[PDB]
Ligand binder design. Structure first.
Ligand SMILES: Nc1ncnc2c1ncn2[C@@H]1O[C@H](COP(=O)(O)OP(=O)(O)NP(=O)(O)O)[C@@H](O)[C@H]1O
Length: 243
């Protein structure tokens, strides 16, 4: 993991303490800030490290498919993500998009340690360390009636706040350099020739709504379009759609 900003280093320290606990952890941060990477770090630093690490993007599925993907269904079986994570960790991304029906069912799994399994088959007991992520203001949603207060009262045992790249301004150039060098290797340039002051201004003044994912893409495209080691990279191509 790249980064020397104190805000980022404080996250890594927090994660090293939280990881060994079986308690649920909420990660708040923008897209591209490394939320999944942090969830993974929580699993690999925990006592569950040899168990499975399973992920699911709540925003990606309609209500009935999300219900079935998470909790499973009987119509043999399609095991849900809680079952597949048994003895391990389950990372639920974009939590704030989970419908209220899913949120209530999730609280039940957390409070009772089991999944309901219709009739015929006994309820399934599960043993899963939960990590969830979002960029929403969950307390505001609770006020608006779009997120369950009860779920949040129990789910947010602690909160990891990942800083956006624009608040780690020291790390922008560090990471840009790293990504430029890697792209130099990929296209066989002998040396990364540096960033001009204009390029640095462009990099540091942009707000990076896509954070680290967007930085890496921008920098790769920019090295490629530059295409030489003979002189420093001057043109940072933030928006490939205008040219
Ligand atoms: N500190 C870091 N150092 C190096 N690469 C990073 C760092 N944090 C994130 N990345 C990279 O940026 C990417 C996005 O990280 P990811 O963990 O998927 O972020 P995310 O916050 O979960 N984004 P999203 O899919 O929109 O929810 C991946 O290519 C990375 O490996």
């Amino acid at each position: 993991l790249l980064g020397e900003a104190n805000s980022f280093l404080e996250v890594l320290e927090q994660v090293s303490h939280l990881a060994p606990l079986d308690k649920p952890v909420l990660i708040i941060g923008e897209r591209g800030t490394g939320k999944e990477l942090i969830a993974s770090r929580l699993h690999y630093l925990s006592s569950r490290w040899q168990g499975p690490f399973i992920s699911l993007n709540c925003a990606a599925l309609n209500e009935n498919l999300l219900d079935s993907e998470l909790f499973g269904h009987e119509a043999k079986r399609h095991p849900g993500r809680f079952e597949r994570a048994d003895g391990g960790t389950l990372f639920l991304d974009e939590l704030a998009t989970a419908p209220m029906m899913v949120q209530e069912k999730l609280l039940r799994v957390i409070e009772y340690g089991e999944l309901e399994r219709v009739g015929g088959s006994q309820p399934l007991q599960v043993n899963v360390r939960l990590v969830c992520a979002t960029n929403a203001d969950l307390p505001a949603m609770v006020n608006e009636g779009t997120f369950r207060a009860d779920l949040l009262d129990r789910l947010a045992f602690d909160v990891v706040q990942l800083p956006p790249l624009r608040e780690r301004e020291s790390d922008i150039m560090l990471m840009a350099e790293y990504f430029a060098i890697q792209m130099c290797r990929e296209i066989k340039l002998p040396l990364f020739p540096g960033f001009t002051e204009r390029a640095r201004e462009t990099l540091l003044n942009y707000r990076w709504p896509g954070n680290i994912r967007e930085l890496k893409n921008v920098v790769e495209r920019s090295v490629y379009r530059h295409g030489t080691s003979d002189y420093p990279l001057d043109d940072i191509i933030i928006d490939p759609f205008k040219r």
